[PDB]
Amino acid sequence: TLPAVISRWLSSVLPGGAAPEVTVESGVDSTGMSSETIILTARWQQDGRSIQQKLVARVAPAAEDVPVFPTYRLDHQFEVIRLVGELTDVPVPRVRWIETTGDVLGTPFFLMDYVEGVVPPDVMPYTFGDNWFADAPAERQRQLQDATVAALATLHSIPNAQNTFSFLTDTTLHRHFNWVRSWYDFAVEGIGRSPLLERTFEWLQSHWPDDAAAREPVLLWGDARVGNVLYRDFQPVAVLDWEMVALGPRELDVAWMIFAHRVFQELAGLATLPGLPEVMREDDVRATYQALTGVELGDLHWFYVYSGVMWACVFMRTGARRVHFGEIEKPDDVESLFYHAGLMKHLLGEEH
Ligand SMILES: [Ca+2]
Ligand SMILES: [Ca+2]
Ligand SMILES: [Mg+2]
Ligand SMILES: [Mg+2]
Secondary structure (H helix, E strand, O other), X not given: OHHHHHHHHHHHHOOOOOOOEEEEEEEEOOOOOEEEEEEEEEEEXXXXXXXXXXXXXXXXXXXXXXXXXXOOOHHHHHHHHHHHHHHOOOXXXXXXXXXXXXXXXXXXXXXXXXXXXXXXXXXXXHHHOOOOOOOOOHHHHHHHHHHHHHHHHHHOOOOOHHHHOHHHOOOHHHHHHHHHHHHHHHHHHHHOOOHHHXXXXXXXXXXXXXXXXXXXXXXXXXXOOHHHEEEEOXXXXXXXXXXXXXXXXXXXXXXXXXXXXXXXXXXXXXXXXXXXXXXXXXXXHHHHHHHHHOOOXXXXXXXXXXXXXXXXXXXXHHHHHHHHOOOOOOOOOHHHHOOOHHHHHHHXXXXX
């Protein structure tokens, strides 16, 4: 039915007689689970010749899908991607159509143009080696890193972000914090409580980053990590995955990108692989960001703890989905799924 629906929308935009045909090129990830986005191929006729275009749909998930997040606003995702395209030179897919109602497919979705490129893999994590990024020269890896930090710096430099992105909304960090707490509560419902995360929320509250939270917020990409960027020749050609897009302190995106790589380094170490220890180091990332923006980042410590909580919410949702699909048993202790738990306990033992 998604291909049927896109074919119909194509019939309403292309010349009469184009007779578009739409098929699914890719609707699952490499483990056979439904993917975040679906790649479709559209074929039609124009002046006696075949035209073929790839399109990408993002569809909101239904309850029986075990969604990661408690609510979805695909309309906010679509508008940020559009505005980023308009206001900056950060490469993003061209948006084409949003169906906000859910009356057509069952749930809201939007369509974008396909961008060709490669992503540093999540499956297996790129720190496991045997992939284009891990196997590239150090120089090439650092070019990609620096270009990706540069894209982030550009996003964070959009003027008057609270006005321009007002649909996204005490401080912005306060409101984001309450949303993470709601995400945890949502996840608890599917898999059980984590005493660790509950003590961490208390820690986060009692060591609030007052200065960072008081400064002017910026547009936050959210899941700001190399796995969510398409590259060609080690340069970004599309920044993807705006699900966690927000307004907030710039430290949150920068801490997220650095910590995301540390979670994958930790998984690689558990696999007794050495990983990519020279990639996404805090010192290098802070130097690049600060040289590009002229803005001093607050200490990232709180934001790393905070990122750890959010990764744990993801793992709690992945865990629930895997039991729902019979793939695992509901774990004796949910914290077993948090392989960054030790990373987090060491951070919580520091004094900043
Ligand atoms: Ca542009
Ligand atoms: Ca200590
Ligand atoms: Mg992603
Ligand atoms: Mg996502």
